[PDB]
Design an enzyme around this catalytic site. Structure first.
Site, PDB file in Angstrom:
ATOM      1  N   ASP A 119       0.827  -1.181   0.000  1.00  0.00           N
ATOM      2  CA  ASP A 119       0.000   0.000   0.000  1.00  0.00           C
ATOM      3  C   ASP A 119       0.864   1.235   0.000  1.00  0.00           C
ATOM      4  O   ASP A 119       1.767   1.370   0.818  1.00  0.00           O
ATOM      5  CB  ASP A 119      -0.920  -0.046   1.218  1.00  0.00           C
ATOM      6  CG  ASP A 119      -2.151   0.806   1.042  1.00  0.00           C
ATOM      7  OD1 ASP A 119      -1.983   1.988   0.696  1.00  0.00           O
ATOM      8  OD2 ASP A 119      -3.266   0.282   1.218  1.00  0.00           O
ATOM      9  N   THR A 157      -6.903   3.780  -1.930  1.00  0.00           N
ATOM     10  CA  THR A 157      -6.773   2.344  -1.717  1.00  0.00           C
ATOM     11  C   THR A 157      -7.912   1.494  -2.233  1.00  0.00           C
ATOM     12  O   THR A 157      -7.673   0.588  -2.987  1.00  0.00           O
ATOM     13  CB  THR A 157      -6.588   2.026  -0.221  1.00  0.00           C
ATOM     14  OG1 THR A 157      -5.458   2.720   0.252  1.00  0.00           O
ATOM     15  CG2 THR A 157      -6.380   0.523   0.022  1.00  0.00           C
ATOM     16  N   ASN A 178     -12.809   5.889  -1.131  1.00  0.00           N
ATOM     17  CA  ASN A 178     -12.713   5.241   0.164  1.00  0.00           C
ATOM     18  C   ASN A 178     -13.952   5.469   0.994  1.00  0.00           C
ATOM     19  O   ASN A 178     -14.190   4.734   1.926  1.00  0.00           O
ATOM     20  CB  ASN A 178     -11.494   5.718   0.961  1.00  0.00           C
ATOM     21  CG  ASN A 178     -10.212   5.105   0.458  1.00  0.00           C
ATOM     22  OD1 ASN A 178     -10.217   4.075  -0.208  1.00  0.00           O
ATOM     23  ND2 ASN A 178      -9.112   5.732   0.785  1.00  0.00           N
ATOM     24  N   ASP A 259       2.413   2.821   3.158  1.00  0.00           N
ATOM     25  CA  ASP A 259       1.428   3.915   3.155  1.00  0.00           C
ATOM     26  C   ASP A 259       1.407   4.621   4.513  1.00  0.00           C
ATOM     27  O   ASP A 259       1.443   5.836   4.595  1.00  0.00           O
ATOM     28  CB  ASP A 259       0.023   3.372   2.810  1.00  0.00           C
ATOM     29  CG  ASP A 259      -0.974   4.478   2.463  1.00  0.00           C
ATOM     30  OD1 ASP A 259      -0.720   5.243   1.524  1.00  0.00           O
ATOM     31  OD2 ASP A 259      -2.028   4.544   3.135  1.00  0.00           O
ATOM     32  N   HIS A 263       2.275   8.631   4.994  1.00  0.00           N
ATOM     33  CA  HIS A 263       1.340   9.655   5.517  1.00  0.00           C
ATOM     34  C   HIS A 263       1.960  10.425   6.679  1.00  0.00           C
ATOM     35  O   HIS A 263       1.885  11.646   6.736  1.00  0.00           O
ATOM     36  CB  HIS A 263       0.014   9.019   5.967  1.00  0.00           C
ATOM     37  CG  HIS A 263      -0.882   8.622   4.831  1.00  0.00           C
ATOM     38  ND1 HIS A 263      -1.481   9.542   3.996  1.00  0.00           N
ATOM     39  CD2 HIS A 263      -1.315   7.411   4.420  1.00  0.00           C
ATOM     40  CE1 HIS A 263      -2.224   8.912   3.111  1.00  0.00           C
ATOM     41  NE2 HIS A 263      -2.141   7.617   3.339  1.00  0.00           N
ATOM     42  N   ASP A 306      -0.844  -0.027  -4.886  1.00  0.00           N
ATOM     43  CA  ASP A 306      -2.160   0.538  -5.244  1.00  0.00           C
ATOM     44  C   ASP A 306      -2.044   1.969  -5.755  1.00  0.00           C
ATOM     45  O   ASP A 306      -2.811   2.370  -6.624  1.00  0.00           O
ATOM     46  CB  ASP A 306      -3.196   0.416  -4.114  1.00  0.00           C
ATOM     47  CG  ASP A 306      -2.750   1.001  -2.780  1.00  0.00           C
ATOM     48  OD1 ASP A 306      -1.538   1.306  -2.580  1.00  0.00           O
ATOM     49  OD2 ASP A 306      -3.646   1.213  -1.896  1.00  0.00           O
ATOM     50  N   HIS A 422      -2.261  11.057  -0.830  1.00  0.00           N
ATOM     51  CA  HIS A 422      -2.432  10.602  -2.203  1.00  0.00           C
ATOM     52  C   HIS A 422      -3.911  10.687  -2.484  1.00  0.00           C
ATOM     53  O   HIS A 422      -4.702  10.878  -1.567  1.00  0.00           O
ATOM     54  CB  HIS A 422      -1.959   9.143  -2.347  1.00  0.00           C
ATOM     55  CG  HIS A 422      -2.563   8.236  -1.326  1.00  0.00           C
ATOM     56  ND1 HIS A 422      -3.724   7.546  -1.555  1.00  0.00           N
ATOM     57  CD2 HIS A 422      -2.186   7.934  -0.058  1.00  0.00           C
ATOM     58  CE1 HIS A 422      -4.055   6.868  -0.469  1.00  0.00           C
ATOM     59  NE2 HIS A 422      -3.115   7.052   0.436  1.00  0.00           N
ATOM     60  N   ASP A 660     -20.955  11.910 -26.258  1.00  0.00           N
ATOM     61  CA  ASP A 660     -21.105  11.125 -25.022  1.00  0.00           C
ATOM     62  C   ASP A 660     -21.948  11.869 -23.972  1.00  0.00           C
ATOM     63  O   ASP A 660     -21.471  12.174 -22.875  1.00  0.00           O
ATOM     64  CB  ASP A 660     -19.743  10.724 -24.427  1.00  0.00           C
ATOM     65  CG  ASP A 660     -19.867   9.651 -23.310  1.00  0.00           C
ATOM     66  OD1 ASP A 660     -20.896   8.949 -23.253  1.00  0.00           O
ATOM     67  OD2 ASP A 660     -18.915   9.498 -22.518  1.00  0.00           O
ATOM     68  N   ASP A 668     -22.350   7.441 -28.211  1.00  0.00           N
ATOM     69  CA  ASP A 668     -23.796   7.562 -28.022  1.00  0.00           C
ATOM     70  C   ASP A 668     -24.556   7.011 -29.232  1.00  0.00           C
ATOM     71  O   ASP A 668     -24.153   7.212 -30.359  1.00  0.00           O
ATOM     72  CB  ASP A 668     -24.210   9.020 -27.871  1.00  0.00           C
ATOM     73  CG  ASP A 668     -23.935   9.593 -26.491  1.00  0.00           C
ATOM     74  OD1 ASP A 668     -23.499   8.874 -25.554  1.00  0.00           O
ATOM     75  OD2 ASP A 668     -24.149  10.815 -26.358  1.00  0.00           O
TER      76      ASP A 668
HETATM   77  B1  LIG Z   1      -5.469   3.790   1.198  1.00  0.00           B
HETATM   78  O1  LIG Z   1      -6.349   4.911   0.730  1.00  0.00           O
HETATM   79  O2  LIG Z   1      -4.105   4.185   1.666  1.00  0.00           O
HETATM   80  C1  LIG Z   1      -6.172   3.204   2.513  1.00  0.00           C
HETATM   81  C2  LIG Z   1      -7.560   3.230   2.661  1.00  0.00           C
HETATM   82  C3  LIG Z   1      -8.218   2.678   3.735  1.00  0.00           C
HETATM   83  C4  LIG Z   1      -7.517   2.055   4.760  1.00  0.00           C
HETATM   84  C5  LIG Z   1      -6.135   1.971   4.686  1.00  0.00           C
HETATM   85  C6  LIG Z   1      -5.430   2.495   3.594  1.00  0.00           C
HETATM   86  O3  LIG Z   1      -4.068   2.408   3.529  1.00  0.00           O
HETATM   87  C7  LIG Z   1      -3.334   1.522   4.358  1.00  0.00           C
HETATM   88  C8  LIG Z   1      -3.160   2.082   5.750  1.00  0.00           C
HETATM   89  C9  LIG Z   1      -2.993   3.440   5.963  1.00  0.00           C
HETATM   90  C10 LIG Z   1      -2.825   3.911   7.265  1.00  0.00           C
HETATM   91 CL1  LIG Z   1      -2.617   5.659   7.496  1.00  0.00          CL
HETATM   92  C11 LIG Z   1      -2.825   3.056   8.351  1.00  0.00           C
HETATM   93  C12 LIG Z   1      -2.991   1.703   8.144  1.00  0.00           C
HETATM   94  C13 LIG Z   1      -3.157   1.216   6.847  1.00  0.00           C
HETATM   95 CA   LIG Z   2     -22.333   7.435 -24.280  1.00  0.00          CA
HETATM   96 ZN   LIG Z   3      -3.524   2.642  -0.378  1.00  0.00          ZN
HETATM   97 ZN   LIG Z   4      -3.128   6.091   2.336  1.00  0.00          ZN
END
Ligand SMILES: *[B]([O])([O])C1=[C][C]=[C][C]=C1O[C]C1=[C]C(Cl)=[C][C]=[C]1
Ligand SMILES: [Ca+2]
Ligand SMILES: [Zn+2]
Ligand SMILES: [Zn+2]
Ligand SMILES: *[C@@H]1O[C@H](CO)[C@@H](O[C@@H]2O[C@H](CO)[C@@H](O[C@@H]3O[C@H](CO)[C@@H](O)[C@H](O[C@H]4O[C@H](CO)[C@@H](O)[C@H](O)[C@@H]4O[C@H]4O[C@H](CO)[C@@H](O)[C@H](O)[C@@H]4O[C@H]4O[C@H](CO)[C@@H](O)[C@H](O)[C@@H]4O)[C@@H]3O)[C@H](O)[C@H]2NC(C)=O)[C@H](O)[C@H]1NC(C)=O
Ligand SMILES: *[C@@H]1O[C@H](CO)[C@@H](O[C@@H]2O[C@H](CO)[C@@H](O)[C@H](O)[C@H]2NC(C)=O)[C@H](O)[C@H]1NC(C)=O
Ligand SMILES: *[C@@H]1O[C@H](CO)[C@@H](O)[C@H](O)[C@H]1NC(C)=O
EC number: 3.1.4.39
Length: 780
Positions: A119, A157, A178, A259, A263, A306, A422, A660, A668
């Site tokens: 991730d 994700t 999400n 991920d 963050h 992802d 992201h 479209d 279309d």
């Molecule tokens: B994705 O958008 O990064 C996402 C969406 C939902 C849940 C988890 C996720 O990423 C993995 C993850 C991110 C964190 Cl900050 C903590 C744990 C897992």
């Molecule tokens: Ca169309």
């Molecule tokens: Zn992700």
């Molecule tokens: Zn994330």
């Protein structure tokens, strides 16, 4: 009888219904594990690694994994058992030899596939190389890899993992964010709720179902977060050791990293080394485990992410309250994208027109842009789902949008709780992610072009001998990733045959095919009536139903010359004697429609001679155009085409309209057309495309090309104003090209939107042409 306890059932492959308790690896996520699941199935004693002193130990069932003589047979050795106890090397310490055929134990029916999902693994993390990630770097360098893989929008994700699983755009598979609100269900989907477990949200056919349905057994594709990574790997290896009748052929592993750390620390944080090293260790445990089972030259492994990660902080946030009078009336899905809806569903006083007006170009530096969803770049394929709100904000990379200043919280020290995020436009470099494929079915030491994650599902089906469910990949476009199991694609059969007509309120004052139509006529893949029209400078496929060309084809050599429209022909439109009046446009309609003017598909400016320029003013080369859009189109035609011809050693251009109205990414039918030039049967296009092709080897001219091709294309929205471009009061040199770049497209996108099939007559293989058709020129 095995109910009531997980004795003999730990990580059972066949899930069990109530009122029995569960022992599979999602029982934690459903609160349904038997009372003894942790005690029996989640052993931790003595950790995850054999040490010398444990070699040949008497088996102790309390241990996490084993170093006893029987462990290879039982299938539950620690992954380093043979390295510590039997003098063997780690997988990563061996050089890679080409795997020409799978080397599987007798009794395997196909090479297994293991998908290793990471991730938030940004493509550029791979640059850290073996210093940080030796196992991953071995897979990358020894197997088949792309320098990056393009995610889907939004670059989050749930939409991306479910796209990986289905080969579908989010608008089609239904997981468009999400979090989501469905107005028919009147329900909300979120990470932190039970709604997400209901099958009603989840469309298409994911790989585990495609496999199961065709007799290929699948392991779990989901792991409860309380299962440690080491235990996930050991469980896969135990499943692989099952007997022929029970062993799965496809498996997935998922890591929440990198991920979480991205963050917290940003993608360039020195902290990022740690999660990358940890992920690599987990890769090493898997590969060592396979190697000690002699499955390291049997299994196909995919290492895939992802989406990537961008530098984003609290301080870079735009607030809707600075633009809008009443942010109390609305709900915003905030962050790296914006989706707006009324706070009260159906609120009849909800007016997205006036909201969009108040969000449009209000400050010079503005770090988001409002769109009705139908006006988003068509390359995003982000409109055709009731769960996508009408009003969308595309946010600039590195920024956030929020409703109001207090939605943002920083500690009194000035510290923000996150430094990475992201979700942005999927052509943004920082959002790109990784793809590596390693094993007998993938090529050895092969770098392939960047590709889109919608293509992977077909490839995963190929690797397992499965027929894919209908999806948005282009089957065959990734055949160059594989040594074998390639899908042999077939040209779609042309449905309508062209007519070739001879000579049968507007005023004014052969061997075309050879020069202007370089890759054969496009095939029309639906039932319709149309004419092929030849001219000195261009060729067209003219539709008697839509009263305009479906396509117009022309070649501009590097030395071609731009001329002006003689000011005595500014309003010139000539009847076409090949086409009867009933199937032609007219100028009365354009005079009578005060908002609609017209342009030309082949540009008069590029005519080869004064005499030839007269063909360019034919009624059959005319298309309806808002004055605002003509500023864009004339600049493309007068300026950009020769710039491209000059830089690319000539170009072949195919241009045409797209209709479209229902924003489904598909051509279309008549019925779907919602606008006509006033008092007429002349349909108004929603977009105009162009496909610009030249020789990849640009020392050869476009019309004399012996090898692979080079393409860029766009799909321009046909808008009655230029509100999308904040600098559009300026000269076109300051904004039109940036607009075009935003609306860059794949040839395949145009094909869906037109019912046409291009590049049918080349010297290239059809698989290579499919790769070409899926290419997107990103300008990054
Ligand atoms: B994705 O958008 O990064 C996402 C969406 C939902 C849940 C988890 C996720 O990423 C993995 C993850 C991110 C964190 Cl900050 C903590 C744990 C897992
Ligand atoms: Ca169309
Ligand atoms: Zn992700
Ligand atoms: Zn994330
Ligand atoms: C990209 O490729 C695709 C594929 O070829 C192109 O075609 C489009 O594909 C779409 C995706 O299948 C398809 O949409 C579907 O349209 C039908 C009819 O309108 C609609 O019923 C489908 O609805 C479901 O799926 C959506 C999400 O996809 C869900 O949100 C919705 O609630 C429905 O869910 C259920 O059915 C699904 C299977 O279709 C199940 O997976 C899901 O679990 C759920 O089933 C259960 O819940 C039910 C309700 O309680 C219950 O009855 C059942 O027993 C289960 O428990 C979906 O919206 C388009 O129709 C299709 N378009 C065309 C023209 O064919 C697309 O064109 C390509 N794009 C481009 C640009 O080329
Ligand atoms: C198989 O074992 C299960 C698990 O104990 C039995 O189910 C239990 O039945 C008793 C009644 O004798 C109940 O009090 C428990 O609540 C039940 N537990 C569960 C999980 O259902 C089941 O009856 C057994 N079946 C047979 C034929 O032996
Ligand atoms: C849009 O702006 C104008 C003020 O210029 C105001 O009358 C109106 O309330 C605003 N509408 C919204 C929805 O913000």
């Amino acid at each position: 009888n095995t109910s009531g306890s997980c004795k003999g059932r730990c990580f059972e492959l066949q899930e069990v219904g109530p009122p029995d308790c569960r022992c599979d690896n999602l029982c934690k996520s459903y609160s349904s594990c038997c009372h003894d699941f942790d005690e029996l199935c989640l052993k931790t004693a003595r950790g995850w690694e054999c040490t010398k002193d444990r070699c040949g130990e008497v088996r102790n069932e309390e241990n996490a994994c084993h170093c006893s003589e029987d462990c290879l047979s039982r299938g539950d050795c620690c992954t380093n058992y043979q390295v510590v106890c039997k003098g063997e090397s780690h997988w990563v310490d061996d050089d890679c030899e080409e795997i020409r055929v799978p080397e599987c134990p007798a009794g395997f029916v196909r090479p297994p596939l293991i998908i290793f999902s990471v991730d938030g693994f940004r493509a550029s993390y791979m640059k850290k190389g073996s210093k940080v990630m030796p196992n991953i770097e071995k897979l990358r360098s020894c197997g088949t890899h792309a320098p990056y893989m393009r995610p889907v929008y939004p670059t989050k994700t749930f939409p991306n993992l479910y796209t990986l699983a289905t080969g579908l755009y989010p608008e089609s598979h239904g997981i468009v964010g999400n979090s989501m609100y469905d107005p028919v269900f009147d329900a909300t989907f979120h990470l932190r709720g039970r709604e997400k477990f209901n099958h009603r949200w989840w469309g298409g056919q994911p790989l585990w179902i495609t496999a199961t349905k065709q007799g290929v057994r699948a392991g779990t594709f989901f792991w409860s977060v309380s299962i440690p990574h080491e235990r996930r790997i050991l469980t896969i290896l135990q499943w692989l050791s099952l007997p022929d009748n029970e062993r799965p052929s496809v498996y997935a592993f998922y890591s929440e990293q990198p991920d979480f750390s991205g963050h917290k620390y940003g993608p360039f944080g020195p902290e990022m080394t740690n999660p990358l090293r940890e992920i690599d260790k987990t890769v090493g445990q898997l590969m060592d485990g396979l190697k000690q089972l002699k499955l390291h030259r049997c299994v196909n492994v995919i290492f895939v992410g992802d989406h990537g990660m961008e530098d984003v902080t609290c301080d870079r946030t735009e607030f809707l309250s600075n633009y809008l009078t009443n942010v109390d009336d609305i709900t915003l899905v905030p962050g790296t994208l914006g989706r707006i809806r009324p706070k009260i569903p159906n609120n009849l006083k909800y007016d997205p027109k006036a909201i969009i007006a108040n969000l449009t170009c209000k400050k010079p530096d503005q770090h988001f842009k409002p769109y009705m969803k139908q006006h988003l770049p068509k390359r995003l394929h982000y409109a055709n789902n009731r769960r996508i709100e009408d009003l969308h904000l595309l946010v600039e990379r590195r920024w956030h949008v929020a409703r109001k200043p207090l939605d943002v919280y920083k500690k009194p020290s000035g510290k923000c709780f996150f430094q990475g995020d992201h979700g942005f436009d999927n052509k943004v470099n920082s959002m790109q992610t990784v793809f590596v494929g390693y094993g007998p079915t993938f090529k050895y030491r092969t770098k392939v072009p960047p590709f889109e994650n919608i293509e992977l599902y077909n490839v995963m089906c190929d690797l397992l001998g499965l027929k894919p469910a209908p999806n948005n990949g282009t089957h065959g476009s990734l055949n160059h990733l594989l040594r074998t199991n390639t899908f042999r694609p077939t040209l779609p059969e042309e449905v309508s045959r062209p007519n070739y007509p001879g000579i049968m309120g507007c005023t004014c004052d052969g061997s075309t095919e050879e020069r202007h139509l370089l890759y054969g006529r496009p095939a029309v893949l639906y039932r319709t009536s149309y004419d092929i029209l030849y001219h000195t400078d261009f060729e067209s496929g003219y539709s008697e139903i839509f009263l305009m060309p479906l396509w117009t084809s022309y070649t501009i050599s590097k030395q071609a010359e731009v001329s002006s429209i003689p000011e005595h022909l500014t309003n010139c439109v000539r009847p076409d004697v090949r086409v009867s009046p009933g199937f032609s446009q007219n100028c009365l309609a354009y005079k009578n429609d005060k908002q609609m003017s017209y342009g030309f598909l082949f540009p008069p400016y590029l005519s080869s001679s004064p005499e030839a320029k007269y063909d360019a003013f034919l009624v059959t080369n005319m298309v309806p155009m808002y004055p605002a859009f003509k500023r864009v189109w004339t600049y493309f035609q007068r300026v950009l085409v020769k710039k491209y011809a000059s830089e690319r050693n000539g170009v072949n251009v195919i241009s045409g309209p797209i209709f479209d109205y229902n924003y489904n990414g598909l051509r279309d039918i008549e019925d779907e057309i919602k606008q006509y030039v006033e008092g007429s049967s002349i349909p108004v296009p929603t977009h105009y495309y162009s496909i610009i092709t030249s020789c990849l080897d640009f020392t050869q001219p476009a019309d004399k090309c012996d090898g692979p091709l080079s393409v860029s294309s766009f799909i321009l929205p046909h808008r009655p104003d230029n509100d999308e471009s904040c600098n559009s009061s300026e000269d076109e040199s300051k904004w039109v090209e940036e607009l075009m770049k935003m609306h860059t497209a794949r040839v395949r996108d145009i094909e869906h939107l037109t019912g046409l099939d291009f590049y049918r007559k080349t010297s290239r293989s059809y698989s290579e042409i499919l790769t070409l058709k899926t290419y997107l020129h990103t300008y990054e």
